[PDB]
């Protein structure tokens, strides 16, 4: 007659690592690393992402003629932009403090576009002829829809003195620009006056831009350049423009409808027609695991990212052969 | 393992014990079978459950990568940003992998400990009453029926 | 007859955490986290902090008329500034490279103010009338005490050519400014000359400032702007000013008396009339603990900061009920 | 615990033993009382004292937050600064909390180990001379007076 | 140590055992000498070898300082760069020093464990056949020649 | 008759640390920290470092007359520069975006210098007389060898209109500069025209520089200043210069021969005539250890750096006395 002490074995095949030994077969284990994603771009908690596709943030905000899909956009959960979007800055140039603006966008879910200075409002200057072949729409020379390429009227460009005051409660993103022409003769041809300026002022802003003439390579078949500037106009503050040429005047400006909590993720993927609680630039995550190894940059209720290929905890004991 | 029981003096586990992690095999005239020790099994379940939760929650505060963009003449600051975000992800990857490694070793040893303690406890009751076979088993000097056997299991033998 | 092995129990109520079990009652323990502070701003090793209160670093250094408490300050242990100090930049404008200057201040304990260009020294220009209602003192229009708002004399503003050479051993913080007026007529009214400049030069500096005219909102009842600039003048180096208008000339400059080792902590608290070896923006720390959880930003012999609510080490053994 | 002694086969501690962490209770015709084993207590004191110091000093090199200011158009670099300073404080908070957690477990087990070793040592002297009761106690076959008892305590029995 | 054997009940090691970490000393009419237990020695060698490799490789992903230069008016960003690079080097220095510290303790205890298990195994064979001296040694009731001794070493005694 | 269990001791003196005890003597141990280096600057995998010695990156690239050792350099493994190289910017001034350029250099192993605009190519301007006493060579007033200090010819400085197009496959580092004179009279003396500009344009660049007149301290016996600018000219892109004075024209430009993987390490050491697989600013590392404590900044197959003085793992057991 005999009594024995012993312990559980089973048919378990699961293996765990320790410091002194790798691939110890254990009776029970718990995987804590999510290795799977669906591979789509999905709505985040029902809320759809703003998927630019081909358009860039610049192309969108300035109103590139090819970026009409985004003339008015619903509030988004997050933004998606490609690595090299074709529809950016159709007319060649620069966007001043672009990255600091994109940074600001990552804390905004809703823009609401409102008109500040109407096209019809331009008496002494031509406002219908400020177009270019670098920015075409339906085969015809067009221009950034949110600004106005102002030109001389009957061989005169009088000093522009324009003022808008933010009556809205909400902060206001105001965009404007300056045209840098190719030579002395083009300055005359478009603006009449040889030497020009654009002075911009708010409660904080104290700006004066002067056109830079230079000879340069054609980008999009044009050697002229546009340089775009922006500000956030506080409630009850006014913005004062004064210019005698090269002015790219605001037509529309974006109301800062709401904050906050979004991202601008870089992805070549298209909309997936799905819904998730955690989104990565590579696809969505649906799991109860504490960790994942999909991508570092996520949005939503997400597991903690690690660069591991495998995280498995022993729960049971060393399984015997 | 550290405590000599699991795959030590007890050569292997029991496919036939299904209702617990540790227990007994008895063998007598009336027959033979397996009985799980519920007490130590339950203590072990609690231990391992708490551990997993402790491990998970101690990792819930970790670094979160955030997207930042830099122009063509901000290369140094872009590099700085890259090396900082990568640096933290490596720290946390290491923390996670090591914690799993070290605690897996401690879990296996924990089970070994639980088996040795249960063994020693039965050894302390039997005293000189049975021969200690040296493989986890004790061979009784006297005949030991089911209720005698039941007696050993509940710590009431003598 | 019996002998037994056993271990200590007591009436201890202290509890410690482990991986497998929380709230294990132990016979002895050691708390290693300091959870307490006194809640005051105190002297650091006898040495008093420079408590600006309402004044900002700009208001202090430029010599805001309302910042007279700090015309001459003893060496400090550390600086304290509020989140939004009322007395800053009384006359609206900007302070160029402000943050890089504040950074420099965090490695300085003593400034000594010395006169470089006296008010009395201005022959061809009016130096008594460069005041504003935006910067009042005792009910009358005043101005930043350390600089000079120079104006035309008998309808002429001759070219200023001024030079100071740092004979001192010590580095010298030299501040100056430029006035940006509202319109063409104000330029004439104050400075006579229509187009102006301020050229500043040292061994390293090569500067030329030009006034930016713009229309802008009133801040402190004034639409003009002041832009302030600074440099550190090395020993044996000279600073050369040349200007025909809009010049805000140095009167006083700060000797860099000593380095180093201070901070500019942000705090709404006032002086506490106490002494400490470790100070936080929330209060002082007096303890022998290795860790604390008060505030990340400390100065002095301080415990290491952690975000824990509790750090307790077991020293004794599991206490039995 | 791992070594089966503390709150294992020795059901609970002794309120009446005050001069040490581990020791003896004796009971005979002459009376009864507690004597601390000074040797193992002292070894344990040294162990735990060194540990605390090791823990403290290994933490004396940590990250120190420094105040940096940024203007309205330096938001990215301000964010970078925030996430770096916060990132390190989280790493160190984790390091500290985990070290305390893991070492508390090792300290409790250390004490358990010290109790088991002392027990085993006394068991090795007594041999067949006394009945091993199974609860930390040994019951002598022969009468054992105070100096016989003193003999067990100093390792000179037989 | 935790398992009571090494510098516990076995007072010291053996200069005369050269071919292994653990083994036997035998003493009889025919003579005396040392025989290494190859099995447990080999298991220990594997354990410690794997550990060292695990330690090394878990550290192969670490922070690498990169040189960045900043002008006279980029002091904040230079300071940021310095505190980030220094911050990581401190994290890794701590990780490395602690891992070595903790694992050294676990290695010493591992050896102690291996000695106790081997001892217990021999104790389980001898049974009542020999007196347990209490110092690592067993004194036989019967005369025990070399092949009797060889028998104990290969687990075939009885 | 007796059998005993026991364990190995030896004459080992090696000690290891644990949490509860320091200096435990063990039978066997393994040191994992490399504490030694040779103290020389060595070739990295056969490939020699570019050791500037006295010259700086600026002095090298611009072609300082004293930096002739480096007129044409073989591909390097890494670069070495002193903390304060004497031969830098011989003619006083600034190098615009210097650090961002040095950053770019850390990802380049080979430059190949090619002529873009020959000295002989200057018809209407003097190109032989653009020299200074601040940059001497063999006792005579010389100048940066890679650029051209252009001067008026027969009291006229006609508008320069020059264009180079990158026919090369490889990116091209193009350097140029602007001279800032001391006064109105020097402008006339050198360039004739009172007010001048240099406009530079590529597909991306849109630049216009204007000379800044100021009075300033003599550095290297000269009060004039040179400000140097650079760009990377993409393949198939053209660079267009237009200037009427103060132009420091490109003569040579560096072909971007190859990337990548180098460093610019700061070191006062000279070439060591050795070879290594891992180099530090203090000396070379030859060891199989996983860690070292030499210097944080290394290049090659290197052990991981730690600030430890000692890392020793126990392998054997506690050695007994
Ligand atoms: C056999 C013995 O001694 N153990 C007792 C058994 O006798 C008793 O019948 C049972 C409940 O009655 O509890 C147990
Ligand atoms: C009783 C015994 O054997 N142990 C001895 C005791 O006899 C002796 O008197 C004492 C000092 O004399 O040391 C112990
Ligand atoms: C002595 C004994 O029982 N052990 C045996 C021995 O007798 C035998 O001679 C040897 C090989 O023959 O193997 C072992």
Author numbering:
A (entry chain E), C (entry chain E), F (entry chain E): 5 to 325
B (entry chain F), D (entry chain F), E (entry chain F): 1 to 158
Question: What does the publication say?
Answer:
However, a prerequisite for efficient transmission of avian viruses between humans is a change from preferential recognition by the virus hemagglutinin (HA) of α2-3-sialyl-galactose-terminating host cell receptors, predominant in avian respiratory and gastrointestinal epithelia, to those terminating in α2-6-sialyl-galactose, which predominate in the human upper respiratory tract. Thus to better understand the nature and significance of such adaptive changes, it is essential to monitor HA changes that may affect receptor specificity of avian influenza viruses, particularly during human infection. A single amino acid difference was observed in the HA of each egg-grown virus: Asp186Glu in A/Vietnam/CL1/2004, Val134Ala in A/Vietnam/CL105/2005, and Phe151Leu in A/Vietnam/CL2009C/2005 (H5 numbering). The effects of the single amino acid substitutions in the HA on receptor binding were also studied by X-ray crystallography of HAs in complex with pentasaccharides possessing terminal sialic acid (Sia) linked to galactose (Gal) by either α2-3 (LSTa) or α2-6 (LSTc) linkage.
In the wild type H5 HA complex with the avian receptor analog LSTa, the first three residues, Sia-1, Gal-2, GlcNAc-3 were detected but in the Glu186Asp complex only Sia-1 and Gal-2 could be seen. In the wild type HA, Glu186 forms a H-bond with the 9-OH of Sia-1. All five recombinant H5N1 viruses bound to numerous α2-3-sialyl sequences. The preference of ‘wild type’ and mutant H5N1 viruses for α2-3-sialyl glycans with sulfate or sialic acid on the 6 position of the penultimate GlcNAc residue and their reduced binding to glycans that are fucosylated at this residue is in agreement with findings from previous microarray studies with recombinant HAs of A/Vietnam/1203/2004 and the H5 consensus sequence.
